[PDB]
Design a protein around this nucleic acid. Structure first.
Lengths: 346, 96, 224, 153, 344, 115, 153
RNA sequence: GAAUGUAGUAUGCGGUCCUUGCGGCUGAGA
């Protein structure tokens, strides 16, 4: 039922707080995590909610370029609906319905829920590269074979959807095993004359193998090009460390930011009674990848420029490549901004 | 918390939740009082063929003291609180 | 704690001597405490016999036994005044009517506690740091040396008898010479009258009490 | 040996210790408020620094020499200031929960198997320290809830 | 997110951006990013002082909107005559924030769920770190990571403002310095030697004129021709760019460590455990933070604040060349900065 | 899509009460809410919690097959052995969605028919 | 299995503080001076650098520089209590920065081949900054344990 | 016997307030 799949790289430029209100814990406000592994995660319902909100805003403001041409939803509504189009745009003008392309791609409004569904199925954003502080260098981008196995298993989903062959051959040579006291890291972190690297508060002996990091690096180039979210990818290859699954789990659990927010009584000038609460934030420069699966638009009476999924894919790629979103909500305090870079596989 | 709660810290836990989720102290105290009074009368279905406990609940008596004499008061109080929250959820859905 | 076994407040950027605003606030508060103790020593002791007895017991526990030594002197008066201003600020409402003469104007106890703030209310006066005016930094030196020559150091430390031995070992500490001009500034947040009262009290404190080290030897004294 | 029985043991133990502190130090509200604030602050210290770091930090606020690290030998009533009493009581509760749970009779008998949690951090692996960290965070959450419920400041 | 304003913070006095969530060797640390360690001021703390300062200006009727005084009592009365006195009583008893503040920053904690604020105060990142030097007493130090993060900030405002012309100002910066190398002006390099001394290290000087000039131009565009009290050209020769880890070492070591004591009048010395250490951001440090402005979501807005542009100019005209207090130790003259409101 | 040997090291057989308790409480409960763009906050009453089966959950279902009703069927689907091979081949290594959260990336399951 | 460096830090600090407490239990002055020196050392390191602190420790020891091998120092061979405390502090710091908690331990030591004073003498500033962080951390642990279990003055 | 769809745990909140790096020491001995 799905013909094309487009990946969605996410690079946090500010701390990200995806709130998880379904937690029976009063110590802090935690970010949602995969319960069975503890890895940080952003649910598709949250990710789709910010995608649909951003896409609707662009269509309302007439900024989406379709087939290298501007899109006019108002004019297209007359071409699509003809009769009762003026009645329909009143609902959108009253914020009761969403513009045409938004309803085609993500789905109709709550009132018109039973009319049809959307064209895309926003996946779940999972961890790919975690930033932890290191003794040598400012910090390091960390991953693990479990994350790598998850990424390779994700390409099987795309390969099966598009009936491709080279997609599953991308990581077919990835057989990386790591002891608890071993790691594979670049030369920007290795302590001089020791073959050791100190991530956070752990000393890890450096393994002697360069193919694992090299093939991993070029995989990101396939999905994100050479421009690694504004910086050359070779500049960050030297600071990528591969740690064991258990060691990576410790980094995900405890190295996330914890901030002690507070409110102060204006009259007294000190902290108000009972006004003290702490939150947990995903660290900045955290790389997460989603997987958007898009099928044919269920709703009929649609313009030729959005005929098939391939036509729909180019709309998402153009309007979202190298774009900044706000996932999770702490917007008023400048938290949640993330760079987004889409792109289909080979 | 209804699964893991006991009669000793019933009042303290309820008071904490009320003062946390209320608007002021008087509303929290009123919620604590109404929860404490109402949740006493709730019928329970134990695994054993026990109707005496329901008979004690049906009137309002030394059942509270009898609960201390009773050998499975923890299950009784847990079922009582869970049923009271279930019925108040029904009422809230009805009004809303 | 420096390698030289001594140090001096030098600015991290320009390496000039300066007086931190915390020191100014502390010396102003302590001069207010001393003036209050001298002016109304026994009165507040009568008003606050309970806390003074508690303080005497605390001193007794710390200092050997001294079960009822507790000399009701200016030291204990200042101690109980500080305890009132630090942990029993609510009890100061009774003595808020009292006024102490500083310079020419009078200042209420409530005015003082509003100036310096408490554990539950922020102070109403901002105490800025003091810096030397750069005009004189070229003509006269802003830094100079001083001498510490502790004869009888073993007598003071190891308990040896005094007399004409224990050859002294001298060490030196840096200090700004006398006559160096400084600029002070205090800003209020609610009432400017509070700012001017704090300015007068701080001026009197620097005139009499003095700030910095060796304030008991006449060091750190200022004049108009 | 399910989750809910562990939660029952945590609730019972936290209520017991908070009630003991409330009854023993009912007159002085300063120590009660200090204990409540220290409890509500403790788990975040553990998250930011670690269980060993916060355990040592608690041990450094005793204003009295300690012969050897041991929670049983502590006696918070000896200290005078409310701060030291609160720190000693919090450390004692944390260590006794991590070393004995709710007693040997209860389902949860602790993790360190009677050892001082500071020693357990000292000579055990990182995985065990992480598990003890999670247990300490959970018990501290329960203690904070009960202290906010009962203790007055 | 229609328009974004960049706020520049320059510390006249040491700033203790309190953290209060950790313990260290030198007690009372400052809030820093965990994975990097660079000193930052989180948006929540920075927003609070801005909101608090805004309240005093409005409550004292000092805000100049469209070069006109803002009488909030009548403005609220005209806008909300249905409950003009009811709302006034709420702010009279400090239960609610005044009219303008709720529009700009957001409603008070009492009315949390009424709407959302129109301002997204970003975190304040380190831009220039003053580091002691042999010649050129202190050098403004920057790192490739900082400018790279600055480049992404310019990309964000460019996307928000839909102005590509501002997205290529600093795009010509790409430097790969080793630990022992640096890019510094002539004022820091020792005479007769291609080496510089930055408070603990001897770094060989790498020669490339455009890198500093590009950065110098960026600040000139960002904050005008007055660098908080001195010409930019007077400081263009004092800027030094150091390696990534060298900059990290400087921020983790060169921060001010101040020893403070409490003197009990009973004895005259330091009390029992009455001494503690406080960590401060060094004086003359530069920190920037974007102030994103969205559509004001309040109902029945006045015509003077209806759109984002009218909000932006009010923010600029009220928070430019002003002095604020950041962090604790307000009463002892600490945490004072001079703020500059700049637009790309 | 994973090596079989990498799975053999991660089986943990527990007691029935422990296993039963895990399935009740170790599943992901996800809080959900709808936001109105008019105010930017949440809508009153638009808050609820939904529970999801965790990923990496190996389910298995027995598929019972019988001889189809004789209605002049094609020559390739006469007996049961032919009608099961088509089902197994067309569904092995498939990827279909179950449940009512397809649009938010919930439901995709990899199927392995037993050959 | 892996072991976090914080565990090695705590173990080393507890070992050295317990060793000085047990060896000089009668010497109250030695314990008090060592506690004061341990609490004052990190500030000196921050103000003047690690190498200056290490040399200043030897200045009070009256031993000359450039012959500084910590293995060749008998800290008990000094008559004065201040000299004893300074020798103990210098030996502990140098041992941590040169060997860590032992070769078999998780932390094998930063310098690992010579005395940390010589390391600061003839090595780049990034390595001395790493050593400064390590020294500050171990000094914090030692100060905590000394303030807890050692008699003050 | 056969025969879901639509949905951002978000909105508002300053790790603040109170704390003198103080205490003691002959640039002197012939």
């Amino acid at each position: 039922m799905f013909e094309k799949a487009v990946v969605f790289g996410l690079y946090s430029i500010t701390p990200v707080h995806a709130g998880s209100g379904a937690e029976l814990s009063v110590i802090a406000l935690p970010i949602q995590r995969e319960r069975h592994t503890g890895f940080p995660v952003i649910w598709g319902q949250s990710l789709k909610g910010v995608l649909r909100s951003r896409f609707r805003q662009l269509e309302l403001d007439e900024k989406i370029e379709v087939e290298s041409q501007k899109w006019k939803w108002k004019e297209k509504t007359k071409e699509v609906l003809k009769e009762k189009a003026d009645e329909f745009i009143k609902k959108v003008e009253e914020r009761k319905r969403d513009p045409l392309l938004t309803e085609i791609v993500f789905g109709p409004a709550t009132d018109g829920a039973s009319e049809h569904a959307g064209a895309v199925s926003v996946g779940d954003a999972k961890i790919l590269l975690f930033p932890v502080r290191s003794a040598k260098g400012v910090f390091a981008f960390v991953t693990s074979p479990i994350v790598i196995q998850r990424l390779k298993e994700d390409f099987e989903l795309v390969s099966e959807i598009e009936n491709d062959i080279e997609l599953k051959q991308i990581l077919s040579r990835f057989k990386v095993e790591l002891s608890n006291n071993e790691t594979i890291a670049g030369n920007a972190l290795i302590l001089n004359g020791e073959n050791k690297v100190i991530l956070e508060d752990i000393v890890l002996k450096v393994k002697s193998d360069s193919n694992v990091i090299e093939n991993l690096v070029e995989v990101l180039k396939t999905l994100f090009g050479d421009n690694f979210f504004g910086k050359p990818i070779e500049s960050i290859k030297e600071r990528i460390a591969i740690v064991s699954d258990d060691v990576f789990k410790s980094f995900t659990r405890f190295s996330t930011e914890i901030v002690a927010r507070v409110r102060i009584d204006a009259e007294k000038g000190t902290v108000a009674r009972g006004g003290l609460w702490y939150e947990e934030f995903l660290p900045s420069d955290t790389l997460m990848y989603s997987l958007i699966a898009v099928g044919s638009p269920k709703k009929e009476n649609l313009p030729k420029e959005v005929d098939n999924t391939q036509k729909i894919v180019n709309v998402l790629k153009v309007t979202f490549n190298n774009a900044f979103l706000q996932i999770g909500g702490d917007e008023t305090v400048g938290k949640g901004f993330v760079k987004v870079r889409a792109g289909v596989l080979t | 918390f209804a699964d893991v709660i006991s009669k000793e810290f019933l009042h303290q836990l309820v008071k904490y939740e009320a003062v946390r989720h209320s608007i002021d102290k008087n509303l929290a105290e009123e919620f604590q009082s109404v929860f404490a009074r109402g949740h006493q009368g709730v019928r329970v279905e134990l695994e054993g063929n026990d109707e005496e406990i329901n008979k004690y609940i049906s009137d309002g008596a030394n059942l509270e003291t009898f609960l201390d004499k009773y050998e499975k008061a923890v299950d009784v109080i847990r079922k009582q609180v869970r049923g009271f929250l279930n019925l108040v959820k029904i009422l809230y859905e009805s009004i809303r | 704690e420096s390698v030289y076994e001594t140090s001096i407040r030098l600015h991290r950027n320009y390496g000039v001597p300066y007086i931190p605003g915390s020191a100014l606030k502390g010396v102003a508060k302590h001069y207010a405490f001393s003036i209050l103790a001298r002016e109304n020593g026994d009165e507040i002791l009568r008003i606050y016999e309970s806390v003074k007895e508690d303080l005497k017991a605390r001193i007794a526990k710390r200092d050997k036994i001294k079960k009822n030594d507790v000399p009701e002197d200016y030291y204990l008066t200042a101690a109980v005044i500080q305890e009132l201003f630090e942990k029993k600020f609510d009890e100061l409402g009774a003595i808020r009517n009292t006024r102490v003469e500083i310079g020419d104007t009078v200042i209420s106890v409530g005015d003082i506690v509003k100036i310096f703030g408490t554990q539950k209310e922020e102070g109403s006066v901002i105490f800025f740091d003091a810096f030397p005016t750069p005009e004189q930094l070229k003509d006269k030196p802003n830094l100079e040396l001083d001498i510490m020559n502790p004869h009888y150091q073993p007598y003071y430390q190891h308990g040896e008898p005094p007399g004409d031995w224990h050859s002294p070992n001298p060490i030196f500490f840096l200090t700004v010479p006398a006559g160096v001009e400084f600029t002070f500034a205090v800003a209020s947040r609610d009432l400017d009258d509070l700012a001017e009262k704090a300015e007068k009290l701080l001026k009197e404190a620097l005139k009499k009490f003095g700030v910095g080290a060796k304030t008991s030897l006449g060091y750190g004294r200022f004049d108009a | 040996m399910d989750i809910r029985e562990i939660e029952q043991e945590r609730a019972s133990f936290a209520f017991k210790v908070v009630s003991d502190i409330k009854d023993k130090y009912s007159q002085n509200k300063k120590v009660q408020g200090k204990y409540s604030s220290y409890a509500e602050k403790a788990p975040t210290i553990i998250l930011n620094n670690g269980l060993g770091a916060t355990l040592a930090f608690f041990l450094s606020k005793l204003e009295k020499p300690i012969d050897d690290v041991d929670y049983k030998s502590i006696n918070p009533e000896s200290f005078g200031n409310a701060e030291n009493i609160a720190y000693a009581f919090l450390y004692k509760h944390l260590s006794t929960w991590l070393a004995e749970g709710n007693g040997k009779d209860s389902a949860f008998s602790g993790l360190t198997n009677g050892e001082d949690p500071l020693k357990y951090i000292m000579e055990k692996t990182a995985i065990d320290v992480a598990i003890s960290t999670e247990e300490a965070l959970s018990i501290l959450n329960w203690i904070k809830k009960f202290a906010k419920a009962m203790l007055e400041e």
